[model samples]
Target: PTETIMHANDAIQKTTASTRKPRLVVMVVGETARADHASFNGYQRATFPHMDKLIGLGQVHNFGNVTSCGTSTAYSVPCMFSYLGAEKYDVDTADYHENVIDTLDRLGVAILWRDNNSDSKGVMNRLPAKQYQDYKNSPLQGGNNTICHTNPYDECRDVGMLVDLDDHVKAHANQDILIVLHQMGNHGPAYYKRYDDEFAQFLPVCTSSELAECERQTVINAYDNALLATDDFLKQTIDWLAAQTHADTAMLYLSDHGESLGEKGVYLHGMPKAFAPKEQLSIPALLWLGADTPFAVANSPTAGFSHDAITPTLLNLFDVSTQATADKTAFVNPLD
Candidate 1:
C-alpha cells in the first residue's frame, strides 16, 4: 500500500536566515522512560549517577515535570515533531501536515536521524534525502559483542549509535545541524537485555521477558539498570559535543512516553490519554547547552511544559521563523 503524500513544502515557508556559524543540536528521543524513577527528579535510587554529576556541575538542566504528548511511541513521536500541539494533534491526519524537521530542512539546516528504536514513525518521510539510519537492524561491527548483541531481538545498545557520529558533524561543519538519536531506552518487557552486565548494579534482576514470572522488585532492578545505561550513553554524548570546537553544541533529551511498573494492575504503557496513569504520562526532559549557545537558561520554563514546546523551541533555536514561531507554546529561546 502506498502512503499519503505530504504537503510539507507547500505549507512550510522559511522567512528568516538560519544560524551562520556551525551549530549542532543533538536531540535524543528516549523510549519508555519514567520521570519519577529517575534520580534527578528525586527518585530514591541513583539511576542517573552520571547525569546527576552533570546536573551538579550545572552542565545539564533537568526539567522535572514534563508531560508526554501520548502514552506510546507511535503517537508521541510524530506529535512532538508536528506543528500541532498535543490537544489538537490527531494521528489520523498527522501525515498530511509538515513537522518541525521538514520546516527546519526547508530553512537549510542539515538533518540526520539515527534510530535504535522501532523507527521514526513516518516523521522523516517527506525529506528529500534518505537521511535516516536504522541501527536496530544493522549488524554489530568487528564482532563487538560486549556493547551490543542479537539473540532475543535485533537491538543494539544506545551508545552504539555514537559510532562515527563526530565524522558526520565535521563533514557538515558549515551549516546548522540537527541529529536525532532515537533510543531503545528502558523498553520492556526485555529491560534486562537493554544494558551490559557492568550496569547490573541492582541485585537479582528479572532476567525473563515475562513480567509475571519474576518478582516486582526484580523487575524494578532490571528497569533501573537500563536507565543507568541510558545515563552513561547521554553523558558520553554530551562529552562528545563538548569536545567539538567547530560548533556551539546543545543536547535535548526527551522520552516519547513513560512506563507503568505493575502499578494498579498496569504492566506497561498506552492506557488512554484521559485515563492513563501518571506513571505513563510523566516523562523526563534534559537539556545541555554549550556555554556559547544563545539559549537563555534563565528564560527556560520550569513548569507547565509539554511536547508542544518542542517545535517552536527548535524554530527559535535555529532562528527560523514560521507561523508556529509566533505561537505561545515556545518554552525556551536565545538571549536577546
Candidate 2:
C-alpha cells in the first residue's frame, strides 16, 4: 500500500531505458458484464453511456475471446497475464508457473500486479493445486492474520486500480508508466451495484424485486448501472492520461472473459471454457493512446489472438524483442 517506493526506485532505471519511456497500460476488468447486454454492443438498458461518449477515439475489437478453460476468476487473472499460450494460460498454470512478471522484470520494466479483485490473487497463489480462485485476501490485507473485506466494491475495482496507478505515476514524477488496470467490470450477483447510485439515472430505478416484470429487467438494470460506472471510468482515465503532457500514456480495457446472465440459465461466469457461450467468452478490448506517445502501427487485427495474445502483444508494446512461441497476433498499431 505504501507504493513500494523501493521496488519502484530500483525498477525505474529499467523502465526508462526501455525503447519506450513512461509507457502506461491500465486494463479495466469488468466483472460479470455480458457483451450483448452492453449498450455498446446494443442493449436496451443502454448502460456504458460514458464509454460511448467517445468511440472513434479507440478501436473496439468485437471478436475478442477468452481462452481460459474455466470462467472462474481463479483461472482468468493468472492465464491472461501469463505468457503461456491459450492452452497453457489455463491448464498450464503449473507448467508455465512464471508469468509475464518475470519477462517484465528481465526487461527492466517496473511491473505492479495490483488487484482490486479478490485480494489481488494473494501475492502469488499459496497452493499450486488451487489453480483458479483468487488469493487476494491476504497480501491485500497486509498479509497478516486479518481478514479481507467480504464486499469489495462490485464495480469500482477499476477506480481502486486507477488510484493506485495515479500514485505510481505521481511518485515516479518523470516517467512513462505501463499500468495495467485489472478491472472488476461485470462480475455478477453483485452486478446490480456496478454504477453509482445516481447513475441509476433512469427513473424508477428498479426499486423492488417484485416491481419488475421479470428478474432479467432488474438484472439488466443492475448490470447497466455497472456499465455506466465503467463508462465513467473510461472517460476520466483517458482524460487523465491526455492531460499529462510530460508522459505519454495509454490504456486498454478488456475482460478476462465475458459474462452470461441466465441467457442459458447461467447466472455467473465460472464454467467449463468449452461450453461457455460467446457472450461469456467474448470480451471487449479497446486502446487509448496519448498525444506524447508516438506510434504508427497499423490498426490491423492480430489473426490469432485472445487471452493468449495478451502476453505477446504486451511484449511488443513494451518493445521487448523476445519472439513469441507462436506469432499469430502481429501487434496492431493503435497509433496508426
Candidate 3:
C-alpha cells in the first residue's frame, strides 16, 4: 500500500512539474514574405532590420523551407499549419485540418489569433461584426475610409490588428497564451502600400503596384517596412511577456509560404510544385522564446530544420507532452 502511495505521489509531482504554465507563445505568420527579401538572408535592401536584431539574440534556421502549396491564403495557411506534410499536403483533396489552437484548447492553454490578413482565419468565428472585420479590403481603401493601404504591395491591416491584440492581451485573459499575427507584408500587386514613404529607403519607386520593376522595389520597401514594424511588434510583445507575473511566455514567426513579385511572371503564390519556383518553396522561419519558457537553448546561428519539425519542437518548447507523429511532425522549436 505504501509503495502504491509513493508511486501515485511521484506521478502527481511529475504532472505538476511538466505542466508549468507558459507565459506566452506567439506564432506570427507573415503573408507573402519571401525568404529572399529578408535582410537576415543577405537582401540588398536589408528589408528586415528588426528581424536582424532578433537574429543576433535568437536562433535562426537559415535553410528552412516550406511545404509547397497554393499561393492564396484560402489554401496555404491551413495547408502549412495542418498536421499533413508534403506527402499528405494535397490542396485539392485536403479535409479541414486541426491547428495549434485546437491542440492548445485541449491542453487548457489560452489562445488568441490576431490576423491582419483575413479575420484571423477561423480563430474566433463568433460575433463576426464585433471583431476580425475589414481585414483585407481593397475597395474600402480606394474610398479613403480605411487604414489598410489595400494596395496589394503593402497591407497595413496587420499593423492595426496588432493594436487590437495588445488591447485584448492587456484585458487580462492571462492564462498560458498563444497569439498568431498574420500580416500583409507583400500580398502583391501593391507592395508599395506595405511601407511608408519615409521607409521607401530602396528608391526607384514603383509608379504603381503594377509596373513590374516599380512594383518590385515598392514591394521591397513596403515589405522591409513591414519587417521593421514586425520588429517593433516583437519588442512590444517581449515587454508584454516580461511584465506577466501570472504566466511564463514564448513567441514564434513563420510564413505560410513565400511570395514571387514578378519573378518569371510569378506575381503571387499558390503555384503547383510542378510549376512553383524555388522562391515560393523557400521560406523564412523564425522563433522568439521568452526567458520564462521551459526552453533555454543557446541562441546561436544554426541550420538543418524546417516546418516539419514544428509540432514536436513545440511540445518541447512549451514543455508539454505530445505523442510523436510519423515524421516527428511539429511546430518550429526554439532550438532549431
Candidate 4:
C-alpha cells in the first residue's frame, strides 16, 4: 500500500509541468556546523568572513535560528530531505520513501549528488544509479595534495568536489540542474585534520582527535578553523555559481546537525533529542540567490524554522508542486 501510494503521488507530480525559468541550484549539506559559532548568527570570532561579506552586500539571506530534524547525521540527513517533518520522522521507515531529490528528478530537473561526507545516509538511494558520486575515496586527477587534503580520517577535501563542476553544469545546459554537495564540514574530534594550515587562523588549536586531553578553548579553536575552511569553500562555490551564464544560479547551505564542543561535559554530538543541548540542535541555514533568479527571499523568523522547510522551499523555487508540497514550512515562497 505504501509503495502504491508513493507511485500514485509520483505519477501526479510528473504530470505537473514546470514553466519557471531554468536554474542551477546548489544545495550544500554541511556537517556538524553550529549556528552559535557562525558569525552571521552573532558569534564574535568572524568565522564566516566571506559569507558575512556577501550578507553585507545583501546577496545572502541568513536564516538566523534554524533547528535540525535530529542531533546525529544518521538521523538528520535522511530526515531533512524527506517529506516527513520532524514529528513524523522515523529512521526505520525513512528509507522506504522517495525523497525530495527523487521528486525533483520526476519533474524533469537534472540531479547530481556529490558527497564528501561519509555518505548521503540513504537519502539518494531512490535516485537513478549513476546520479551520485563518492568523492571521499576517488583519487584526484593531478594528485591528492592539490585540493584533496591528506589526513588519517579521509583523503579528498570538500573543495575537490568542485573539480570539473563547471563542465558538468555546461553539459546539462538545456535542463534545470539541482546539485547536492554534501560537505564534510567540521565533522570531528579531529577537527584540525579537516582543513590545511592556511585556515588555522585561531592559534593554539587542539591537534589530536582525543577531546578529553585538549582544553575547551583548544577544541573550539580547531573547530573554528574548520569553519573557516568551510567559509572559504562556500565562497568558492558561490563564485562559481555567480560566474555561470548558462543558468540563473542559487546556493542554499544548511548544516545537517550542530556539534557539542566540551559544553556541559559533552565532548561531541549525537545526544538523544530529548536531552540534547542547544549546541546539538541549533543549526545554521542560509541562501544565496543569483541576481536574476525568479525566486525572492522571504524573511525567515529567527526561531521557528527547521529542516522541514528545505523540501518545500526547493519545490517552491522550481515552481514544482505535488500533494506533498507544504507551503507553510517553506523559507522562501514565490513572489506575489
TM-score of each: 0.90, 0.74, 0.73, 0.92
The regions of model 1 sitting more than 4 angstroms off are 1-19, 140-147, 150-154, 298-303, 334-336
Q: Please, what are the lDDT tens digits per residue for candidate 4 over residues 1-336?
A: 256115216323322223445688999999999999999999999999999998999988898878998999999999988888898889888888877887788777889988888788888887776788877765544232235645554557888888888776777777778999999899998899888777988989999988989888999999999999999999999998898865677899999999998887897899999889989999999899887676777766656788999988887766665667745568777543
Q: On residues 194-292, what C-alpha lDDT tens digit does candidate 3 reach at each position?
A: 655545565555646554555455555555665665555555665555565555566666676777766767766777766677677667766665554
Instruction: Tell me, by lDDT, which candidate is best.
Output: 4
**Which of the two, 1 or 3, has more TM-score?**
1
- The deviation in Å at residue 196 for candidate 2 is 2.3
Instruction: Tell me how far the alpha carbon of residue 55 in candidate 3 is from the true structure, in angstroms, after superposition.
Output: 1.8
| Candidate 1: worst-modelled 10 consecutive residues by lDDT | 10-19
lDDT of 2 at 145: 16
Better of 3 and 4 by lDDT: 4
lDDT of each: 0.81, 0.53, 0.54, 0.83
How are the candidates ranked when ordered by TM-score, highest leading?
4, 1, 2, 3
What candidate 4 gets wrong by more than 4 Å, as runs, is 1-20, 140-146, 149-154, 301-303
Decoy 3 TM-score against native: 0.73
Misplaced by over 4 Å in model 3 are 1-19, 58-70, 92-96, 120-156, 164-167, 170-174, 213-232, 296-303, 324-336
Q: TM-score of predicted model 2?
A: 0.74
